[PDB]
């Protein structure tokens, strides 16, 4: 259809949602998920070590 200035206004909205997401959203969620994964992995690892 018709190109518009909106292609420029939307580039502001895009970049800003990527920075706030990158900083606040992603790092903590991945931190929590990895914190669960590590605990179960190493707990069972300790379990099989003591068994032997």
């Amino acid at each position: 259809m018709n190109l518009n200035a909106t292609i420029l206004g939307q580039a502001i909205a895009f970049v800003l949602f990527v920075l706030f997401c990158m900083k606040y959203v992603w790092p903590p969620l991945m931190a929590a998920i990895e914190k669960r994964q590590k605990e179960i992995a190493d707990g069972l690892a300790s379990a099989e070590r003591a068994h032997k």
């Binding site: 300790s46 379990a47 003591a50 068994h51």
Partner: protein, 52 residues
């Protein structure tokens, strides 16, 4: 499982460490008895030799 293996460990060493000594004690006891017989007989045959 970590709790259980520790308990089994402690108990198994409990059995083995002492039982080694109880069997060694049986050994020493029979040693003492056998030496009693040995000395008694080594004395008793002096009678046969002197009568000869």
């Amino acid at each position: 499982d970590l709790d259980l293996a520790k308990a089994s460990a402690t108990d198994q060493l409990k059995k083995a460490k002492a039982e080694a000594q109880v069997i060694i004690e049986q050994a020493n006891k029979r040693r003492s008895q056998i030496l009693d017989e040995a000395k008694a007989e080594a004395e008793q045959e002096r009678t046969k030799i002197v009568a000869q």
